[PDB]
Amino acid sequence: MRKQLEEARKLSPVELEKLVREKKRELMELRFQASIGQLSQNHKIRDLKRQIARLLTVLNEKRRQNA
C-alpha cells in the first residue's frame, strides 16, 4: 500500500495526529487479539505497526520540514 504512503503524504496537522493515534489504538485492539483469530491477523499486526510507523515518519517529515 505505498498508496497508503500517498494518503500519508496527504494528511498533516491534528489530522495525521488523530489519525495515527486512533490507528495505533486499533493495533492495541490487535494486541488483545493475541489469543483469538490470530491466523489471518498476523499481517494486521506486523503491517499495522509498519503503517503507523509510516504516519510517524511523516509527521516528522511534515513539521520538521516546517520548522
Partner 1 sequence: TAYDVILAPVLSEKAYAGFAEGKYTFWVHPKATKTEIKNAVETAFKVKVVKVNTLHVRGKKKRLGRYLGKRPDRKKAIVQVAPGQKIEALEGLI
Residues forming the site for RNA (CB under 7 A)? 1, 3, 38-43, 56-57, 60, 64
Q: Which does 65 bind (CB under 5 to 8 A by kind): partner 1, RNA, none?
A: none
Query: Can you tell me the distance from the alpha carbon of 31 to that of 25, in angstroms, rounded to the nearest whole number?
Result: 10
Residue 27 within binding range of partner 1, rule CB under 8 A: yes
Residue 67 within binding range of partner 1, rule CB under 8 A: no
Q: Where are the alpha helices (DSSP H) in 1-66?
A: 2-10, 14-33, 41-59, 65-66
Helix (H, G, I), strand (E, B) or coil at 36: coil
Site of interaction with partner 1 (CB under 8 A) = 20-21, 24-25, 27-28, 31-32, 34-35, 52, 56
